[PDB]
Amino acid sequence: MGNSKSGALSKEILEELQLNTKFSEEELCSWYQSFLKDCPTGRITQQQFQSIYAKFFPDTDPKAYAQHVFRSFDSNLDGTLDFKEYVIALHMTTAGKTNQKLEWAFSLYDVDGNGTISKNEVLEIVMAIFKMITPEDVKLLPDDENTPEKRAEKIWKYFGKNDDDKLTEKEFIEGTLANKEILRLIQFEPQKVKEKM
C-alpha cells in the first residue's frame, strides 16, 4: 500500500541526515524502522535518551551530560526529540566531525538558552563531562585543566572574560577560530586521550 507510510522517513530529513553523517539512506531508513518500534510516536524522551548513554558507559555516569545534550537539541523544549535530532545528537558526542557545528557547541554551553554563555554554564557542562570519564582518565589531563573549576576558569580566561560577563555567540565563534587552544578546551573530548601534544 505504497503512497502511504506511517513508517516512511521523509526526503528532507533523509537529506539533512545524509549531509551531517556517514550513514547511507538505506542505513537511516533501516535504523528509523527499529527506532519506531521502541518509540511509536516517532519521538524519544529525555529519560530514554539518558538510558541509552547509561547503558553504554559501564564505569561512569553520563546521564547529566546526556541531559544537556538532549536539551541542546530540544528546540520547543518538549522533552522530546524526533528521529533526526536524536541521530544528530548521538553524533555530537563522538567527534566524527570537529569544529563540528560550532553551532551545537554554543547551544550546549548556553544552558539557560538565553543566547549567551556565562561562566556558571561553562562550569556546569564541564562538570557533566567529568562525570563521564574515569579518575584514571583525569590523571592524564594537564595539571591546570584537571578539575571542572580549573577548566572553566581557564576557558573563561581565554575568552578574556571577567567572572560576571556574558559571552555572545559571535565572541564564541571568533575565539574558537582565532585561538586553537580555545577550540581544544571547548570541545572537551579527550576521553582517556590527551591532545595539545
Please report the DSSP string for 48-103 in residue order.
HHHHHHHHH-TTS--HHHHHHHHHHH-TT--SEEEHHHHHHHHHHHS-SSSSTTHH
Closest CA to 108 of 74, 83, 140: 74
Q: Is 17 exposed, middle or buried (0-12, 13-18, 19+ CB in 10 A)?
A: buried
> Which letter, b or e, does each residue of 42-69 get, where b requires 16 or more Cβ atoms within 10 Å of its Cβ?
eebebeebbeebeeebeebebbbbbbbb
102-189 CATH: 1.10.238.10
Cβ-contact 108, 69 below 8 angstroms: yes
Cell of 6: 506511517
Between β-strands 116-117 and 80-82, what pairing exists: parallel, antiparallel or unpaired?
Answer: unpaired
Q: In the chain, which ranges are E strands? A: 43-45, 80-82, 116-117, 167-168
Parse the chain into domains and list their residue ranges.
Answer: 16-97, 102-189
Gap between the Cα atoms of 48 and 39, Å rounded = 9
Under DSSP, the state recorded for 143 is T
The CA distance from 160 to 106, in Å, is 17
Cβ atoms of residues 122 and 156 within 8 Å: yes
Experimental technique used? Answer: X-ray
Give the long-range contacts of residues 151-159, CB within 8 A, separation 24 or more: 151/126, 151/185, 151/188, 152/119, 152/122, 152/123, 152/126, 154/185, 155/122, 155/126, 155/182, 155/185, 155/186, 156/119, 156/122, 158/182, 158/185
The amino acid at residue 76 is: N
Q: Within 13 A of 168's CA, how many CA atoms are on the CB side?
A: 3
Which residues sit opposite 43 in a β-bridge? 82
Tell how many helices (H) and how many strands (E) occur in the chain.
11, 4
- Binding site for Ca(2+), by residue number, is 74, 76, 78, 80, 85, 110, 112, 114, 116, 121
Paired residues of 44 in beta bridges:
81
Angstrom distance (rounded) from CA 50 to CA 68: 10
Examine domains 16-97 and 102-189 and report if their fold is the same.
yes
Residue ranges at the known binding site = 74, 76, 78, 80, 85, 110, 112, 114, 116, 121
Give me the resolution in angstroms, 1 decimal. Answer: 2.2
16-97: CATH topology is Recoverin; domain 1 (1.10.238)
